[PDB]
């Protein structure tokens, strides 16, 4: 239980210290600070396919899955965490059939990511700054 | 991979001389009151560390567990290294600091041709901007290996760099702040008891 | 193409068209009309290599396609610099498509939903719903469509009288099917007209003769065969023959023939319906 | 309008810097910009998914297609198998008329240049001058600011001197009146030779050199890939030829004499 404990999390970009996850009308984004319920995040792992589960604290029987338009959102009916530095993950993709293991990115714009969708793009390596996040135990 | 706890303790590991080649019991240990030992790993503190060390299917093996100081009833956790964390053979990671300058670290320097292992990290927040680090042993010479740590579950390891001599190195690398290495030291030349290293970050 | 009006069509859906809806101000697939609101000015911007698409809106001209961030929702909105707005072309020269891409996020582009009829943004794939045709409004006008011209001051005169005779004058509106006229489109760049009811029957001016024209069959290569239509309000236009770069009234009338008076330079027209 | 013609690939980037295949091993790079068959390209479209290829044109290997290996982030080509990662999808940016150039496997990649270690990623789509490139003709792209004019050997041409203008057949002298820059203009899409404007077909050959004239205008179509022609555009039925083809010191340049000889062919060098 050392490696993500499950509970309360903040998840926020590497690019603002200000920016927390917020799912609006379906679509998450990083909003200000607002001391709300919709910022906050609950962690599970479970075993049954050995993988972790982002869902909403204000929105309860929602876990953060895939569409296929390329971008994220949270469903009520699996993700593969890398951590590469301190405070710094990378949710991987679980299927890697017949393509590659595709990860959560984010488009900025000389350090700029105000009202940015996350997509899922495909990924290689680490290197890539406009990848990972930032979970916070709150 | 063998710890205990949160490393509060350090840990020896020690493999009987002649065991294996006598009664067996699949799945069961058969002890055959053997008391020669042959030392592999381990330090005499209170350090932070972990060993990772190749153990073979046949040898029986003791543990040395130093005399505890707070009964906060302590735990030994062996887990099978399946993954990348099989260049760190017969060694013990020592978890280590905090802003810049020269910081020295001390510990029992092993034989020659073995394996100690320091893990550390790099002060400062969020790719991001790099810091200078150099690192030179005082007394002993030894070859050193970098690496960068990655926690996937189990700890992928990737190389950046090799084949660096120690014992007053002028060279310099640059390092992401923020982030956790491994440095693999082999001692090439024993000229001291203790082996005694410095960081320094810029 | 700076500062051009075109029209955008799903390539999956020939028969689906961008339109505006009134009032509201969100944009949707909808069938083949003939009304401003299916018409769209790109706009070049060499400052950051942009494309900005206006409306031809009459009511509010100043509506432009905004994304609406982070929201899947594209609709009409002001123009205030900013970058949710702007759009960036490729042209596949493969296949003539046209793919539309969110200037903000490079990787999302336009995505039709013909099940919920929309434009959403999706990432970009092997697929015929993210592809679009754009084309100038007047080529995909009259590309292929049975309409009917009419004259100015005159709601109740059409162009038309028989089958034996090949003679084209002014008439009253009936429905007929002599009457109405099939505009047809590539490699000459030119219009050609038919006859609904005269089959094989195509435009025809007589080099020879004056002012008067007729009705014939194909002649393969020739001048006097196919026509120009040119843009002048925004629904009027100017037929004119290509061996000079035009069609006028009679001066003052049931029974007159329009024949062809003078060059560019009255003279105009209006498109209806049958 | 692109189908089985020879294509040259250049980096915003980097005006110089042009697509090279380095013989022996399959590696494309950014090796300056050279001239030859190694930087030469070919389109072909597959009338079956709307995609198309690049064909490397070499003369020891010509099924060198560009391919794309597992996604490990290179590019490196093989051989030809027609497979889906095979072909290559090509977008026109009508905005700045730039290309980009897409996998068929998957559009969300596109060609990237780090001009760091000459090389080329496949990354996803950015706003930086990297992502795109420039698809040009391998007779208009060297042809813009090349410089030896010969027939079918080491001779080449010189406008007599300076005080007068004609032309003559020498060796190479190192003279700077021997240098004819080969410029295109994209006005009218045609050729212009100066020295340090052809006008001609103005008293039967009257070759010189002298506008918005249509006799200075001239035209380069290949026949060897190496050997080429100049046509004049007014009149387009006559060809840069020689009076009678002997390779003397001395020989004044003719026009017409559209049979195709080896004295109406021309090879353009670096010098």
């Known amino acids: 239980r050392t490696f993500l404990p499950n509970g309360n999390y903040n998840i926020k970009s590497i690019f603002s210290g200000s920016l927390y996850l917020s799912p609006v009308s379906g679509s998450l984004t990083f909003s ?107 | 991979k063998i710890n205990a706890q949160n490393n509060l303790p350090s840990l020896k590991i020690y493999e009987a001389i002649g065991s294996g080649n006598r009664n067996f019991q699949s799945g069961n240990l058969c002890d055959d009151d053997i008391k020669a030992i042959n030392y592999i790993t381990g330090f005499d503190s209170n350090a932070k560390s972990y060993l990772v060390v ?142 005694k290293l410095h960081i320094d970050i810029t | 193409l700076n500062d051009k009006i075109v029209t955008i069509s799903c390539k999956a859906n020939t028969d689906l068209f961008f339109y505006q809806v009134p009032g509201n101000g969100n ?64 042209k596949d020269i493969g296949n003539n498509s046209f793919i539309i891409a969110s200037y903000k996020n490079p990787n999302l582009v336009l995505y039709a939903d013909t099940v919920a009829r929309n434009l959403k943004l999706s990432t970009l794939n092997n697929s015929s719903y993210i592809k679009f045709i754009i084309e100038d409004y007047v080529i995909s006008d009259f590309k292929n469509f049975t309409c009917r011209i009419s004259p100015i001051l005159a709601g109740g005169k059409v162009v038309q009288v028989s089958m034996t005779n090949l003679a084209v004058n002014l008439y009253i509106w009936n429905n007929d099917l002599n009457q109405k006229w099939t505009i047809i489109y590539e490699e000459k760049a030119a219009y050609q007209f038919f006859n609904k009811i005269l089959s094989n029957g195509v435009l025809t001016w007589i080099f020879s003769d004056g002012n008067t024209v007729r009705v014939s069959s194909s002649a393969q290569n020739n001048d006097a065969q196919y026509w120009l239509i040119n843009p002048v309000n925004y629904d009027r236009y100017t037929i004119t023959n290509l061996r000079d770069k035009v069609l006028d009234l009679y001066g003052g009338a049931d029974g007159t023939t329009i024949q062809v008076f003078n060059s560019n330079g009255n003279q105009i027209w209006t498109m209806s319906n049958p």
């Open chain 1, 32 to 138: 200000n600070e607002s001391s709300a319920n919709n910022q906050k995040w609950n962690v599970e792992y479970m075993a049954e396919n050995r993988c972790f589960k982002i869902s909403n604290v204000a929105e309860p029987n929602k876990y953060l899955s895939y569409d296929n338009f390329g971008f994220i959102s949270l469903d009520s009916l699996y993700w593969f965490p890398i951590k590469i530095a301190v405070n710094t993950y990378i949710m991987l993709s679980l299927n890697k059939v017949n393509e590659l293991d595709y990860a959560w990115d984010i488009y900025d714009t000389n350090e700029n990511i105000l009202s940015q969708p996350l997509l899922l793009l495909p990924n290689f390596d680490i290197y890539n700054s406009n990848q990972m996040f930032k979970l916070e135990k709150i």
């Open chain 2, 54 to 195: 190749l153990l073979n299917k046949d040898k029986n093996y003791y543990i040395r567990v130093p005399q505890t100081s707070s009964n906060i009833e302590n735990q030994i956790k062996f887990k099978r290294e399946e993954g990348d964390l099989r260049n760190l053979m017969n060694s013990s990671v020592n978890i280590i600091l905090n802003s810049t300058g020269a910081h020295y670290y001390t510990r029992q320097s092993p034989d020659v041709h073995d394996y100690i292992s320091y893990e550390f990290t790099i002060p400062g927040n969020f790719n991001k901007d790099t810091s200078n680090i150099r690192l030179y042993t005082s007394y002993n010479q030894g070859i050193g290996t970098l690496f960068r740590v990655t926690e996937t579950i189990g700890y992928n390891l990737i190389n950046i760099q090799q084949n660096l001599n120690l014992l007053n190195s002028t060279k310099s690398i640059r390092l992401l702040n923020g982030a956790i290495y491994i440095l693999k030291v082999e001692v090439t030349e024993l000229n001291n008891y203790n082996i």
């Open chain 3, 27 to 90: 944009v949707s697939l909808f069938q083949q009309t003939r009304n401003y609101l299916e018409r769209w000015r790109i706009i070049y911007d060499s400052n950051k290599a942009a494309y900005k698409i206006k409306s031809m809106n009459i009511y509010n001209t100043n509506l432009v396609l905004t994304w609406n961030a982070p929201t899947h929702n594209i609709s009409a909105q002001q123009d205030s610099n900013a970058d949710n707005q702007y759009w960036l072309l490729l």
